Design an enzyme around this catalytic site. Structure first.
Site, short mmCIF file in Angstrom:
data_model
loop_
_atom_site.label_atom_id
_atom_site.label_comp_id
_atom_site.label_asym_id
_atom_site.label_seq_id
_atom_site.Cartn_x
_atom_site.Cartn_y
_atom_site.Cartn_z
N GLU A 71 -127.52 3.44 0.10
CA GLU A 71 -126.80 2.29 -0.44
C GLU A 71 -127.61 1.53 -1.50
O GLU A 71 -127.10 1.24 -2.58
CB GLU A 71 -126.44 1.27 0.67
N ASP A 103 -111.58 -4.93 -8.75
CA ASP A 103 -111.09 -6.03 -7.94
C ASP A 103 -111.94 -7.29 -8.01
O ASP A 103 -111.77 -8.20 -7.22
CB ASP A 103 -110.87 -5.59 -6.48
N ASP A 127 -120.99 -5.79 -4.39
CA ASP A 127 -121.68 -5.28 -3.20
C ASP A 127 -123.09 -5.87 -3.24
O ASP A 127 -123.80 -5.71 -4.23
CB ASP A 127 -121.74 -3.74 -3.27
N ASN A 147 -117.84 -4.37 -9.23
CA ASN A 147 -116.64 -3.53 -9.28
C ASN A 147 -115.62 -4.32 -10.08
O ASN A 147 -114.94 -5.19 -9.54
CB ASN A 147 -116.12 -3.30 -7.86
N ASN A 189 -119.76 -5.76 0.72
CA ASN A 189 -118.75 -6.22 -0.26
C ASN A 189 -118.13 -7.63 -0.16
O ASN A 189 -117.60 -8.04 0.87
CB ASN A 189 -117.66 -5.14 -0.35
N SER A 241 -114.96 -7.72 -7.13
CA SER A 241 -115.87 -7.88 -6.00
C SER A 241 -117.26 -7.34 -6.35
O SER A 241 -117.43 -6.65 -7.36
CB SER A 241 -115.33 -7.13 -4.78
#
Ligand code: NA
Length: 130
Positions: free
Chosen positions: A35, A49, A53, A46, A60, A51
């Site tokens: 990750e 949308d 991480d 991202n 998220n 959002s």
């Protein structure tokens, strides 16, 4: 902070992650490796949308933490996403625990399904004294 492998192994163990909801320490290690490369201030935007991480487990913003800029998002862990960028990972661990308390468990992360599931991950904790 970018953790050394065994350094992280013991940190997670001390935080009660070994076997949490049936997830071995080695699985948590494998997840963090793929990750974030064990980097606590890693982030990924991202555009789709709106959002992001956050942190070592790349949690998220649409569901788990509040960053104020993600459209129609929620805050299931009840934390500012800033808490997920600290060098001290206690808050991130509390949130990762909250994430696995959902239906999917460790399968919540697609990277786990791709690089950890149905594989021997013992190599991530070998020699760490855990
Ligand atoms: Na949110």
């Amino acid at each position: 902070k970018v953790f050394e492998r065994c350094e992280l192994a013991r940190t997670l163990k001390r935080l009660g992650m070994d076997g949490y909801r049936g997830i071995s320490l080695a699985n948590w290690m494998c997840l963090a490796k793929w990750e974030s490369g064990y980097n606590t201030r890693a982030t990924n935007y991202n555009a789709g949308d709106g959002s992001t991480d956050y942190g070592i487990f790349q949690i998220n913003s649409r569901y788990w933490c509040n960053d104020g800029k993600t459209p129609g998002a929620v805050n299931a862990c009840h934390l500012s996403c800033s808490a997920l960028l600290q060098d001290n990972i206690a808050d991130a661990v509390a949130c990762a625990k909250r994430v696995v308390r959902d239906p999917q468990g460790i399968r919540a992360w697609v990277a786990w399904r791709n690089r950890c599931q149905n594989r021997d991950v013992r190599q991530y904790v070998q020699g760490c004294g855990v």
